[model samples]
Target chain A: ITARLDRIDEKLSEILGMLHTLVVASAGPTSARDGIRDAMIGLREEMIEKIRTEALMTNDRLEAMARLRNEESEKMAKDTSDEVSLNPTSEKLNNLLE
Target chain B: NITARLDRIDEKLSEILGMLHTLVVASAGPTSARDGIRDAMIGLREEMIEKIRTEAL
Candidate 1:
């Protein structure tokens, strides 16, 4: 009977140890804390991926806007040069006709 | 006699069962795995924002 009691006590001790493992960190596969840590790390990775995607999209938009503005500026500059060159010639022709 | 020792073991078993039940219910509650992870994610975001504010200040 005493031997049976000793066995029961030993089993109880093992159960308590397993419960402790579930509640805290330890070796073997019984550590729920390690599982929670993995989940948190995965969550952090997802957040970082989302932030990077947003930043890349914003940079793409900025590049597109800069290209558009540069093209517009070049077009305006060429138009102004053509007008100035034609004005001087037209003025010279008028002076000669007079 | 062995009666007292058996009763003590029984009580210990009952207590262990209660703890196991509590753990199981807590696991199955509204703050489940996915929900708990999301909750912690939001908490981390808030913490980062606070850190940014402090650094900028």
Candidate 2:
């Protein structure tokens, strides 16, 4: 099957969206984080094969955002230091998930 | 046929997304942080489709 490039495009978009959430969140073991990174790279490789390099590698442009999150997480970490744990409180998880 | 290729990609993407909920509160990020990425994702998403069309041509 030719696979209809548009379909691939749609799925790739979905992948990136979910991935955007994952990496920025940066919540996982080193292995898990690296796994996510590698999975993204793998997806990109397929896309680059079909779409070529220059057009697809848009730098993902999220490093600045990631940097900001890191900064905020740092401050939050400090402020919440006295809190019982760094884990998301159940309230936070439920609210976010919903 | 590259159908397998596309299917494989979709499966992997879905897998990553499935694990996203587990991206974790402590290790992952706060809900607000997710909102930040969501906006950036929109722009990149547009670019992906545009480039795909260009390539498909």
Among these predicted structures, which one has the highest lDDT? 1
Tens digits of lDDT, candidate 1, A1-98: 99768999789878765654343111122133343222111122343453345521223443333333324444445565745444677878987788
Model 1, A51: alpha-carbon shift in Å? Answer: 23
lDDT of 1 at B15: 73
lDDT of each: 0.52, 0.48
- Please give the distance, in angstroms, between residue B24's alpha carbon in candidate 2 and its true position after superposition: 7.8
Candidate 1 segments exceeding 4 Å error: A24-98, B31-57
Which sections of candidate 2 miss by over 4 Å?
A3-5, A21-66, A69-98, B23-57
lDDT agreement of model 2 with the native = 0.48
> Docking category for candidate 1?
incorrect
- Candidate 2 lDDT, B1-57, residue by residue in tens: 676777867777777755654443233233335446543432356778798999999
